[PDB]
Amino acid sequence: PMVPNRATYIRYIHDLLSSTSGQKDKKRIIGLDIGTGASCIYPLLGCRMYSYDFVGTEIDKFSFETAKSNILQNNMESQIKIVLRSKQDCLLPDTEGMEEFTFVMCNPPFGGEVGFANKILTESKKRKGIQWYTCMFGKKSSVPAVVDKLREQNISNYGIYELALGKTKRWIICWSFQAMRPHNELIRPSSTSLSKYFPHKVLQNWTLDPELCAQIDDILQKFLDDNKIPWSKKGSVLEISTKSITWSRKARRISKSQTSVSSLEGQMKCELNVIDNQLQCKWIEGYDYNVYESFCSALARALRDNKK
RNA sequence: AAGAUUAGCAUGGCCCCUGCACAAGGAUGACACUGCGACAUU
């Protein structure tokens, strides 16, 4: 029960949505609480921070009266609603002709919490248009048997954020069915104690000298022009929006051929940034990680092999 | 008496080269969803 821990979780939700917002128009963002508890403080803090629109789920009657009492003494009914769900029906509620849910948050009990995440994984396969799913774990030992289940369904857009507040080490496992990819501070922690269950990398760094710090923009423009990768110059940021891989030997051997194979297919949106002689490659959108691993190792080889 | 970290080696994919495809191999520098633990501390 830590107010800075719950606020840090809502701040992870904000950092997860914000780094994965894109260039789209600012719609009203809709959240979905799962098991809001007897306090119901999670959607309250979300609306106090950035004016989200929560339609929370509930399995209790006394806590539903408590949630309505918190609604009555907080008065945000165009933001906060609480809905009693059923036990056999999908706990992820319908759209009902409303505007689509955007992010889903879950405070499971502490079948177990692994089986609860299994039920949410089973129900979440049917919900399209909903972008973000999260689930927070207290025990470290729940990390394997959930992620291994998530290692059964080829879900690559997940992440484990290490909530570190003294003796409180929580692990946020966030998975999504849409291609948006958050930062690397958000999904892969520093401690290697769960290096068996890290998600994939979304950020790569390289360090240079002021010679190559002067030459870094010419190197990046020559790289993104000599490879037919679509790019744009937004300030000092070089943004990249490809819909298939146009940077590998396999891609050339196919391009330099005659068969009717279309392309090696996987969508990527990413950014190149120059911070203090450093080049950062930073992954924004894409279902398949192999596209971004290929691009980051091609960029590493491009920064190395222009030194001679 | 009970185990992690840590320095080298197999394995896995990624960039480069050979290769019609699948393979296989080479070379190379960053990785880890795999292990192998010659020291030293806890």
Curated annotation (Swiss-Prot):
EC identifiers of the protein: 2.1.1.346
GO function terms (MF aspect): U6 snRNA (adenine-(43)-N(6))-methyltransferase activity
Subcellular location field: Cytoplasm; Nucleus
A single cellular component GO annotation: nucleus
SUPFAM superfamilies attached to this UniProt entry: S-adenosyl-L-methionine-dependent methyltransferases
Primary subcellular site in the record, as a coarse category: cytoplasm
Binding residue positions for S-adenosyl-L-methionine: R6, G35, E58, N107
GO biological process: mRNA splicing, via spliceosome; rRNA base methylation; snRNA (adenine-N6)-methylation
Gene3D superfamilies on file: Vaccinia Virus protein VP39
InterPro entries referenced in this protein's UniProt entry, alphabetically: METTL16/PsiM, METTL16/RlmF, SAM-dependent_MTases_sf
UniProt KW keywords: Cytoplasm, Methyltransferase, Nucleus, S-adenosyl-L-methionine, Transferase
Superkingdom assignment: Eukaryota
Catalytic activity: adenosine in U6 snRNA + S-adenosyl-L-methionine = N(6)-methyladenosine in U6 snRNA + S-adenosyl-L-homocysteine + H(+)
Similarity-based family: Belongs to the methyltransferase superfamily. METTL16/RlmF family.
Biological function: RNA N6-methyltransferase that mediates N6-methylation of adenine of U6 small nuclear RNA (U6 snRNA).
PANTHER family from the UniProt entry: RNA N6-ADENOSINE-METHYLTRANSFERASE METTL16, SAM-DEPENDENT METHYLTRANSFERASE
Name recorded for this polypeptide: U6 small nuclear RNA (adenine-(43)-N(6))-methyltransferase
